[PDB]
Write a protein that binds this ligand. Structure first.
Ligand SMILES: CCCCCCCCCCCCCCCCCC(=O)OC[C@H](COP(=O)([O-])OCC(O)COP(=O)([O-])OC[C@@H](COC(=O)CCCCCCCCCCCCCCCCC)OC(=O)CCCCCCCCCCCCCCCCC)OC(=O)CCCCCCCCCCCCCCCCC
Ligand SMILES: CCCCCCCCCCCCCCCCCC(=O)OC[C@H](COP(=O)([O-])OCC(O)COP(=O)([O-])OC[C@@H](COC(=O)CCCCCCCCCCCCCCCCC)OC(=O)CCCCCCCCCCCCCCCCC)OC(=O)CCCCCCCCCCCCCCCCC
Ligand SMILES: CCCCCCCCCCCCCCCC(=O)OC[C@H](COP(=O)(O)OCCN)OC(=O)CCCCCCCCCCCCCCC
Ligand SMILES: CCCCCCCCCCCCCCCCCC(=O)OC[C@H](COP(=O)(O)OCCN)OC(=O)CCCCCCCCCCCCC
Ligand code: HEC
Ligand code: HEM
Ligand code: HEM
Ligand SMILES: COc1c(O)c(C)c(C/C=C(\C)CC/C=C(\C)CC/C=C(/C)CC/C=C(\C)CC/C=C(\C)CCC=C(C)C)c(O)c1OC
Ligand SMILES: COc1c(O)c(C)c(C/C=C(\C)CC/C=C(\C)CC/C=C(\C)CC/C=C(\C)CC/C=C(\C)CCC=C(C)C)c(O)c1OC
Ligand SMILES: CCCCCCCCCCCCCCC(=O)O[C@H](COC(=O)CCCCCCCCCCCC)COP(=O)(O)O
Ligand SMILES: CCCCCCCCCCCCCCCCCC(=O)O[C@H](COC(=O)CCCCCC)COP(=O)(O)OCCN
Lengths: 45, 92, 383, 245, 125
């Protein structure tokens, strides 16, 4: 009856994981917006 | 004003140390005493005391890296010498 | 109340340099901070008066420093006091960065004061490096090429950043003219980081060499540490006066007096004596990408040091072996800057790998394990 | 062999914290520059006025700068015309463009010596030992490329600068013997002046600054101890309070 | 940062083992006097940093007498240190006066704070 912890719980890391991927996806969308006009990044744009 | 955080120092009046009691202090005005009173017997006997304590903490740590650099410098001098090119080609 | 405490502007001066409570037993190693504040003013003041005679064009950059040295009234005093004060700035800063590591100043609750110092440490390296290319000497052109072409190791992005930083295809007029305008800006950022540096120093105060609480015996800053700081100010301005009037070109390199040439390289591209050791860490790794990661980590390894130290005592004063390996690390760095002065030849390459390994292992293996037995020798030796 | 032979320390008269230049040697060194090393080397950073009151008198310098010619502002219809030099102008080099220097000297670029003393490691000792350090033949084992002379002090050994210093190639205005060792001691003195024309004033302002600062530094120790005298001899006693409270 | 209970379970085992308590304890006792804090009048537990909530809790439970004396040894060491000298030989700390007076308070405070963090993460079946 004890969960692995370091002041951060294992249960609380799996609860935030779906949102962490969504925040990661929201960050890539912000990268293409702010790094448009870069000719090298236009290879996949 | 806005509230502030919690620190480990106060100011004159609430410095934040433990309560003290039973400790007394004496002092004398510097207009009434002679400075430079013991500069000799401190430049000779006191300095020698401190040196004899903390000098093997600095010498042996400096005694290892001096022989390590010298046996590399006098080895690099032979490897690039006319008598030490044959050892140079086996390490080059 | 008194006017020095009631006024809005004079109350900030009162609580920082006049009524500030200091530990009563800090030795001369704690005078180093005020010497860096003195040297920051020297660089700026001797720089504003010398910026009135300098042209940042690639055509006039070198020629204008000679005009400062030959035509400006007391123009040689300006440039020797500014070129030697840059070298004296780093020697006091290393003795400030080393006193902190010896007495365990990085430990909590002063970790932010420790991290702001590392930010200050980097910005000063850039500021000195940027002002070094302003002279446009033969050593500064090739010191600019090597350092700036270092970011070509970041994959898929490096070639554009390097071309963006140079302002073109190499080091030419667009490079120097923007290096000078940056060199005038960064000292105003350091001056702003020092203000944030003294703000984190004021919440908890200075430490003492005993490594114990200092709230039991305090004395005011004025008339005690104002006049004790005056002792080292006059000694700092005396040794600086010897290097400025009696031997001005001892610390520098004679190749910087040649105009920069893009066709012919010097016999040996070497950095200044304060960046010399990290040059050996870069050159120890037999790869290009891995060199940058290893070179920059040596600055960033200082950041984990509040976590690796597992001791319940601050400092090295009451520890025989933790005080013992410190001086090897001190000397290993002193040895580390020695190979960088020598060419890349047998057997300096082999020395270059073992020495930089022991450099990194002090933070990551020795400081954590010796600090561990030391807790045990302390425990059974008393029990 | 490739670092170049280390040159020893000689007995220069201006070394030491109180010595000035021998201004008689600056006057003589300027004479052997104009007739020996004026042909292939430049001095572009020396104005004419700096020679007044140091090596020559004012009427002497206003005539030396008039033997040359400078380009003047155009005439009434824009045609170019020349003017004689004045005291505000600089010493003209021997070659107009960098290409014409390399043509006369087999492709080698002869440097500008207005900063040579502070730009070659070896200070004053390296210029002196350069022009007198030429052996009559290269050491056994080495065959030099054509057109290049051997000199051990030069890093790498082989150099493109020949021998220019012989005996009695110049006559002095004060009867000094013109030996190869004598002139080489003089040009290095004149060239050190060119690189450091602030030499004498710097060393006498330093004596003023050191004496002022060294007694300020000592006076501060007395004042520090006078003001710290009440804390240095402060004495504490401890008497344990009763546990009744 | 290596706690204190962690390095004490190391201690009581070495003390009880006859081979270990004969090999290293005779080497540990020279490490204490070579450290040389005894000569300025300092008991060991006065050397530990106190700027964390664990030590601040134990410093409050400390009795008045041991807190008043603790105040004097720190003041004496601060005063003696600024003079670049040492205490007279007849006032140094001996071997027997250096006792663990701050040990039990540190230990009773970590086991009550270990319990708190092991109860904040209970996964009930
Ligand atoms: C060096 C050792 C030595 O000689 O003595 C060390 C010796 C060691 O004493 P200590 O109590 O064991 O240690 C003192 C602390 O280290 C430091 O405590 P302190 O601040 O009381 O001591 C000041 C310290 C100076 O301390 C510093 O400035 C820092 C140390 C820098 C390195 C040493 C100086 C270079 O004094 C010196 O070391 C002076 C050295 C030059 C003489 O102390 C002295 O003798 C101090 C007095 C030295 C002479 C002072 C003369 C003042 C009077 C001048 C009157 C005006 C004249 C001009 C008029 C115009
Ligand atoms: C042979 C050494 C003779 C001195 C001696 O007693 O030997 C042991 C003595 C160690 O005595 P300790 O009580 O075991 O430790 C000294 C403490 O750190 C306590 O430090 P402190 O209050 O004695 O001051 C340390 C240092 C303070 O020296 C500095 O911090 C140098 C200040 C330089 C300012 C200008 C720097 C400009 C840029 C770099 C050039 O000044 C002295 O050592 C004065 C001694 C008279 O050795 C030294 O401290 C030698 C320092 C040499 C500088
Ligand atoms: C992110 C900002 C992008 C700005 C932009 O617009 O960057 C447009 C420019 C390209 O400019 P260019 O195509 O005119 O020159 C192309 C020449 N071949 O990116 C670059 O490659 C250069 C700058 C990249 C960003 C440097 C680092 C910024 C932090
Ligand atoms: C470089 C300075 C780095 C910080 C200072 C340092 O490491 O000093 C250590 C040592 C003496 O320092 P201590 O704290 O031991 O002095 C009081 C002794 N009762 O200092 C020495 O042993 C002399 C160091 C001289 C450099
Ligand atoms: C005959 C032409 C000539 C004369 C006369 C001459 N030099 Fe040179 N000097 C050269 C050339 C050519 C070079 C370039 C050689 C090279 O660097 O290999 C050179 C190079 C030098 C250098 C550079 C050495 C270095 O290590 O890079 C110095 C210093 C120098 N000369 C000093 C002098 C001095 C001092 C004099 C007389 C006072 C003098 N020269 C007279 C032709 C001359
Ligand atoms: C911490 C602050 C500063 C540092 C460390 C610094 C450092 C340097 C260094 C090392 C050089 C090259 C010196 C040489 O070898 O000749 C230099 C040159 C120069 N600096 Fe600074 N500098 C600082 C601030 C300033 C400021 C604020 C200005 C102007 C307002 C300034 C103006 C110059 C100029 C004009 C040069 C070229 C002139 C010359 O050195 O000949 N500097 N600086
Ligand atoms: C211009 C640059 C700097 C100035 C003016 C400056 C100034 C100061 C001052 C006045 C203090 C308090 C007095 C003292 O402890 O001696 C201090 C403390 C400190 N500084 Fe700096 N500092 C500078 C740069 C740095 C750097 C580069 C670092 C670290 C890399 C650093 C780390 C520290 C630390 C750890 C302390 C606390 C020392 C202690 O309390 O014992 N500082 N600084
Ligand atoms: C010597 O190596 C270098 C270096 O070559 C450069 C370019 C920089 C960066 C310097 C600049 C060209 C300007 C950027 C500096 C800033 C801190 C940005 C401040 C303003 C925004 C460094 O910090 C540095 O040291 C690690
Ligand atoms: C913890 O204990 C402390 C402590 O708290 C403090 C504060 C200090 C003191 C240290 C400092 C406060 C250092 C502060 C340093 C700076 C902020 C740098 C200062 C920077 C500037 C002044 C900015 C630049 C601006 C100028 C100087 C402009 C000058 C104007 C010129 C040249 C124009 C002249 C032209 C004409 C027309 C005459 C200590 O020394 C100390 O330990 C003893
Ligand atoms: C940031 C750059 C400096 C770092 C801080 C170091 C502190 C040194 C500042 C000097 C002030 C000392 C005098 C205090 C005072 O007013 O005392 C006054 C009067 O004292 C005097 O007699 C003044 C002596 C004159 C010496 C000043 C020389 C200055 C040297 C230049 C230093 C900075 C470039 C108060 O005296 P009191 O002790 O009775 O209160
Ligand atoms: C930041 C540090 C600045 C230090 C130097 C400024 C000290 C000023 C003391 C005088 C003062 O506050 O008088 C002010 C008036 O100042 C001015 O008119 C302009 C001041 C500009 C200063 C520019 C440097 C009067 O202050 P007052 O009488 O309101 O007192 C308030 C608390 N009793």
């Amino acid at each position: 009856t004890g969960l692995h912890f370091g002041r951060l719980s294992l249960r609380s890391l799996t609860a935030y994981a779906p949102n962490l991927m969504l925040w990661g996806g929201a960050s890539m969308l912000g990268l293409f917006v702010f790094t448009e006009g870069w000719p090298k990044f236009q290879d996949t744009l | 004003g806005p509230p502030s955080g919690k620190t480990y120092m106060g100011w004159w009046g609430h410095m934040g140390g433990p309560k003290q009691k039973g400790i007394t202090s004496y002092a004398v005005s510097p207009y009434a005493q002679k400075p430079l009173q013991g500069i000799f017997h401190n430049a000779v006997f006191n300095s020698f005391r401190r040196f004899k304590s903390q000098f093997l903490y600095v010498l042996i740590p400096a005694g290892i890296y001096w022989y390590w650099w010298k046996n590399g410098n006098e080895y690099n001098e032979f490897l690039y010498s006319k008598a030490g090119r044959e050892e140079l080609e086996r390490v080059n | 109340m008194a006017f020095r405490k009631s006024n809005v502007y004079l109350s900030l001066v009162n609580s920082y340099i006049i009524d500030s409570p200091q530990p009563s037993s800090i030795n001369y190693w704690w005078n180093m901070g005020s010497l860096l504040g003195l040297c920051l003013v020297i660089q700026i003041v001797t720089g504003i008066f010398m910026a009135m005679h300098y042209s940042s064009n690639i055509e006039l950059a070198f020629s204008s420093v000679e005009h400062i040295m030959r035509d400006v009234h007391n123009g040689y005093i300006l440039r020797y006091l500014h070129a030697n004060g840059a070298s004296f700035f780093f020697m006091v800063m290393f003795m400030h960065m080393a006193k902190g590591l010896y007495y365990g100043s990085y430990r909590s609750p002063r970790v932010t004061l420790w991290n702001v110092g590392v930010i200050i440490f980097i910005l000063t390296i850039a500021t000195a490096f940027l002002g070094y290319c302003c002279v446009y000497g033969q050593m500064s052109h090739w010191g600019a090429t090597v350092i700036t072409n270092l970011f070509s190791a970041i994959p898929f992005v490096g070639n554009d950043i390097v071309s963006w930083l140079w302002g073109g295809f190499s080091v030419s007029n667009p490079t120097i003219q923007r290096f000078f305008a940056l060199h005038y800006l960064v000292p105003f950022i350091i001056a702003a980081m020092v203000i944030m540096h003294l703000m984190a120093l004021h919440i908890h105060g200075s430490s003492n060499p005993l490594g114990i609480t200092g709230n039991l015996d305090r004395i005011p800053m004025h008339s005690y540490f104002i006049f004790k700081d005056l002792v080292t100010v006059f000694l700092f301005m005396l040794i600086l006066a010897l290097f400025v009037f009696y031997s001005p070109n001892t610390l520098g390199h004679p190749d910087n007096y040649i105009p920069g040439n893009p066709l012919v390289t010097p016999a040996s591209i070497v950095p200044e004596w304060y960046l010399l050791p990290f040059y050996a860490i870069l050159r120890s790794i037999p790869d290009k990408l891995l060199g940058v990661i290893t070179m920059f980590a040596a600055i960033l390894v200082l950041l984990v040091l509040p976590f690796t130290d597992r001791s319940v005592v601050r400092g090295n004063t009451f520890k025989v072996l933790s005080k013992f390996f410190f001086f090897i690390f001190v000397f290993n760095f002193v040895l580390l800057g020695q190979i960088g002065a020598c060419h890349v030849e047998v057997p300096y390459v082999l020395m270059g790998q073992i020495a930089t390994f022991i450099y990194f292992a002090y933070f990551l293996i020795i400081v954590p394990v010796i600090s561990t037995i030391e807790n045990v020798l302390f425990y059974i030796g008393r029990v | 062999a490739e670092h170049g032979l280390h040159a020893p320390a000689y007995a220069w008269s201006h070394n030491g914290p109180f010595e000035t230049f021998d201004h008689a040697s600056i006057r003589r060194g300027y004479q052997v520059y104009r007739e020996v090393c004026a042909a292939c080397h430049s001095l572009d950073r020396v104005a004419w006025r700096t020679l007044v009151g140091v090596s020559h008198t004012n009427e002497e310098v206003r005539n030396m700068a008039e033997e040359f010619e400078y380009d003047d502002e155009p005439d009434e219809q824009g045609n170019p015309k020349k003017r004689p030099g004045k005291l505000s102008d600089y010493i003209p080099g021997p070659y107009p463009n960098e290409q014409a220097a390399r043509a006369a000297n087999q492709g080698a670029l002869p440097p500008d010596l207005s900063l040579i003393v502070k730009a070659r490691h070896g200070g004053c000792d390296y210029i002196f030992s350069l022009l007198t350090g030429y052996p009559d033949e290269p050491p056994a084992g080495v065959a030099l490329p054509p057109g290049s002379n051997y000199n051990p002090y030069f890093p790498g050994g082989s150099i493109a600068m020949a021998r220019v210093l012989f005996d009695d190639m110049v006559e002095y205005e004060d009867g000094t013997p013109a030996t190869t060792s004598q002139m080489a001691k003089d040009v290095t003195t004149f060239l050190n002046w060119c690189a450091e024309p602030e030499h004498d004033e710097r060393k006498r302002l330093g004596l003023k600054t050191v004496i002022i600062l060294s007694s300020l530094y000592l006076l501060s120790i007395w004042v520090k101890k006078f003001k710290w005298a009440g804390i240095k001899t402060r004495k504490f006693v401890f008497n344990p309070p009763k546990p009744r409270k | 940062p290596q706690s204190f209970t962690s390095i004490a379970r190391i201690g009581d085992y070495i003390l009880k083992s006859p081979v270990l308590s004969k090999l290293c304890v005779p080497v540990a006792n020279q490490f204490i006097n070579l450290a040389g804090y005894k000569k300025l009048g300092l008991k060991f537990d006065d050397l530990i940093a106190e700027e964390n909530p664990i030590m601040q809790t134990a410093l409050r439970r400390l009795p008045e007498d041991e807190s008043y004396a603790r105040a004097y040894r720190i003041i004496r060491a601060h005063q003696t240190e600024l003079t670049h000298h040492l205490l007279p030989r007849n006032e140094w700390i001996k071997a027997q006066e250096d006792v663990p007076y701050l040990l039990p308070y540190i230990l009773e405070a970590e086991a009550a704070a270990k319990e708190k963090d092991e109860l904040d993460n209970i996964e009930v079946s």
